[PDB]
Structure 1
Amino acid sequence: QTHEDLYRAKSEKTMHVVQTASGILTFYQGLEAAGSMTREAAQQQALKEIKGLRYSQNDYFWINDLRPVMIMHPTNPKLEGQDISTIKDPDGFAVFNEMVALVKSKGAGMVNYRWPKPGASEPVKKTSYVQLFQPWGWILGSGVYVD
């Protein structure tokens, strides 16, 4: 039983909720591919639904793209439609640029950074799984706060 085993387990949870939520992307992209909705309408409907999803103690999902621009953020909605390339946490970690570089290399993975909790402003340590949804160039993410 290794350190790697313990960390594999804790973060599996995060991975699985993101994979769960990403099925909404899959569903809506299918309707786009079949010609039943336009891409942009399919995108907006998917965002709207993913915006309301929660698990555990008000843990949530966000979406940003590869540019990077924030597409949907349920607790910081004023970041939406903005270039988020210049955002850095208090340790200097370039949150979204790191996420983009990670998914471009590997498709998905874990990343740690500081972010405020919902409805608060102090940046707290957080560990998130991000996953590229390739047809739309979207990164879906969720994480858990150290407390």
Structure 2
Amino acid sequence: AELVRDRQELIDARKKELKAYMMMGVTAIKPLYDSDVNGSNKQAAKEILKAMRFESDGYFFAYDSQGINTLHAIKPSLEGKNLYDLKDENGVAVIAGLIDASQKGDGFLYFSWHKPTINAQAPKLGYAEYLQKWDWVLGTGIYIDD
């Protein structure tokens, strides 16, 4: 109950951080998002969000509501691929889970994903917000392998 308490504490602190980082990404592209005319500014917003980091493993991705990747900071070759049916190594439907978390839930999802600093799968806590004008489920995450 005691070492479990310290873990919940660490998790909750990370969830607060994730909400802040998400706010930074959303507000960084706000001038573009607000002034957009039929997707005119999406490319410019992608270039900003794909450059942003809060640490080496701290980056943005986005998917549309059909699970098609619209931007990926780490692996831009995912862009335009439909990953709706994608499962992690534990059978978590990652993309569908993030789309649903962001639209119908609290934004959070536990899953495993490539971790940049070790180039291998690791457990992650993702956080996503839905940007309806562009149909982007914009997400980031913290790795919990610690």
CA 1:2–1:95 in structure 2 vs 1: closer, same or farther (change >3 Å)? same
Cα distance in 1 between the residues matched to 2:135 and 2:108: 18
Question: Which residue of structure 2 lines up, in the alignment, with residue 39 of structure 1?
Answer: 38
The 1-side partners of 2:117 and 2:55 are apart by 16
Unaligned runs of 5+ in 1: 33-37
Instruction: State the match for 1:30 in structure 2.
Output: 34
User: Structure 1: how far apart are the matches of 2:22 and 2:71?
Assistant: 15
Against the structure 1 CA distance between its residues 6 and 125, is the aligned structure 2 distance closer, same or farther, given a 3 Å change threshold? closer
Q: For residue 19 of structure 1, what is the aligned residue in structure 2?
A: 23
Percent sequence identity is 23
Counterparts of 1:121 and 1:9, CA distance in 2: 26
Q: Distance in 2 between matches of 1:104 and 1:58?
A: 25
Match of 2:123 in 1: 125
Per-residue deviation at 1:44?
0.7
Separation in structure 2 between the aligned mates of residue 88 and residue 110 of structure 1, nearest angstrom: 17
- Would the aligned equivalents of 1:84 and 1:96 in 2 still touch at CA under 8 Å? yes
Aligned to 2:66: 67
> Is 1:84 paired with 2:83?
yes
Task: Give the Cα separation in 1 of the matches to 2:17 and 2:117.
Answer: 24
Counterpart secondary structure, 2:103: helix
Q: Distance in 2 between matches of 1:57 and 1:75?
A: 10
8 Å CA contact retained: 1:75, 1:119:
no
CA contact (8 A) 1:29 1:39 kept: no
Gaps of at least 5 residues in structure 2 are none
Residue 104 of structure 1 deviates from its aligned partner by: 2.4
CA separation of 1:4/1:68 partners in 2, compared to 1, >3 Å: closer, same or farther? same
TM-score (normalised: structure 2): 0.85
Which stretch has the larger CA shift, 81-90 or 57-66?
A: 57-66
